[PDB]
Design an enzyme around this catalytic site. Structure first.
Site, short mmCIF file in Angstrom:
data_model
loop_
_atom_site.label_atom_id
_atom_site.label_comp_id
_atom_site.label_asym_id
_atom_site.label_seq_id
_atom_site.Cartn_x
_atom_site.Cartn_y
_atom_site.Cartn_z
N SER A 111 0.80 -1.23 0.00
CA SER A 111 0.00 0.00 0.00
C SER A 111 0.84 1.29 0.00
O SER A 111 0.43 2.28 -0.59
CB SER A 111 -1.03 0.01 1.14
OG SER A 111 -0.40 -0.04 2.42
N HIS A 164 1.69 6.01 4.90
CA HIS A 164 1.15 6.21 3.56
C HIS A 164 1.53 7.58 3.00
O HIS A 164 1.84 7.70 1.82
CB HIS A 164 -0.36 6.00 3.55
CG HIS A 164 -0.75 4.56 3.64
ND1 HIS A 164 -1.93 4.13 4.20
CD2 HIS A 164 -0.10 3.44 3.22
CE1 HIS A 164 -2.00 2.81 4.13
NE2 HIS A 164 -0.90 2.37 3.54
#
Ligand SMILES: CCCCCCCCCO[C@@H]1O[C@H](CO)[C@@H](O)[C@H](O)[C@H]1O
Ligand SMILES: CCCCCCCCCO[C@@H]1O[C@H](CO)[C@@H](O)[C@H](O)[C@H]1O
Ligand SMILES: CCCCCCCCCO[C@@H]1O[C@H](CO)[C@@H](O)[C@H](O)[C@H]1O
Ligand SMILES: CCCCCCCCCO[C@@H]1O[C@H](CO)[C@@H](O)[C@H](O)[C@H]1O
Ligand SMILES: CCCCCCCCCO[C@@H]1O[C@H](CO)[C@@H](O)[C@H](O)[C@H]1O
Ligand SMILES: CCCCCCCCCO[C@@H]1O[C@H](CO)[C@@H](O)[C@H](O)[C@H]1O
Ligand SMILES: CCCCCCCCCO[C@@H]1O[C@H](CO)[C@@H](O)[C@H](O)[C@H]1O
Length: 181
Positions: A111, A164
């Site tokens: 991710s 992220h």
């Protein structure tokens, strides 16, 4: 036209590791592939990267590999295998670093690399259309939905928001550099 060598080998590797995790259990595989979780493992250098190969649910691996296939495939085709290799190594290292710093070493998956690829492809297309690389309007919407899903814990991705953001920053920075040159 088919996925290039880097795009393909990454997908194969994630599937093989996911299968290993179902057979042996997640913990058994993490013992071998996780970010170093004890000082005795700090010089097992594969671990600074191999965390990216582990996924913890069907949805996790499905959506990560769909985005990887699409965005990584595009980067590899238009810009070369080398470009994809570097985006992947840098984003996996930095996102993994930030993840372990705030939340410990037990995590995994692509991710962070996907956030980097989203930022790269979008920014490259917004600043440098003549590159042939861009994120389609419609896909911007679904990228944002995927981002929101993780951001507000509606969808478990293993990694935290700060990690992220670190991945996104790598993609944005590289797109910025590439648009200047
Ligand atoms: C919501 C999930 C994200 C959207 C998923 C869209 C996936 C589109 C993949 O297309 C494929 O890409 C390959 C690599 O570029 C090409 O080689 C191939 O010809 C093409 O068929
Ligand atoms: C098939 C997907 C990729 C799996 C991950 C590969 C990393 C394997 C690291 O092994 C290591 C050497 O020296 C020793 C060995 O114990
Ligand atoms: C690329 C990741 C970093 C690779 C460093 C390899 C160092 O090897 C040194 O060997 C001994 C401990 O294993
Ligand atoms: C990023 C640069 C790579 C650093 C490589 C360091 C290798 C250290 C190996 O040490 C082996 O025994 C001593 C530990 O106590
Ligand atoms: C970020 C992508 C993941 C790359 C992982 C490469 C592991 C290579 C292990 O080689 C053999 O181990 C010793
Ligand atoms: C990093 C993946 C998500 C990017 C989101 C950017 C939203 C900007 C929408 O502004 C409308 O169009 C213009 C730039 O496209
Ligand atoms: C929950 C998953 C939802 C996905 C539904 C299908 C989305 C349609 C995206 O199509 C893809 O658009 C790309 C950009 O044009 C092409 O490069 C690619 O060839 C094409 O396949």
């Amino acid at each position: 036209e088919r996925a290039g060598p880097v795009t393909w080998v990454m997908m194969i590797a994630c599937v093989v590791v996911f299968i290993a995790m179902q057979i042996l259990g997640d913990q058994e595989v993490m013992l071998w592939l996780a970010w170093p979780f004890d000082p005795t493992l700090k010089f097992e250098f594969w671990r600074y990267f191999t965390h990216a190969l582990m996924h913890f649910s069907l949805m996790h691996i499905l959506f990560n590999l769909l985005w990887w296939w699409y965005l990584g495939g595009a980067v590899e085709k238009r810009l070369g295998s080398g470009k994809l290799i570097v985006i992947t190594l840098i984003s996996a290292l930095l996102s993994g670093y930030v993840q372990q710093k705030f939340s410990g070493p037990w995590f995994g998956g692509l991710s962070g690399v996907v956030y980097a690829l989203m930022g790269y492809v979008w920014l490259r297309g917004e600043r440098d259309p003549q590159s042939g690389i861009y994120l389609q309007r419609g896909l911007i919407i679904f990228a944002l939905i995927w981002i929101v899903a993780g951001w507000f814990d509606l969808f478990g991705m293993s990694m935290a928001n700060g990690a992220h953001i670190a991945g996104l920053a790598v993609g944005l920075a590289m797109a910025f550099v590439d648009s200047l040159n």
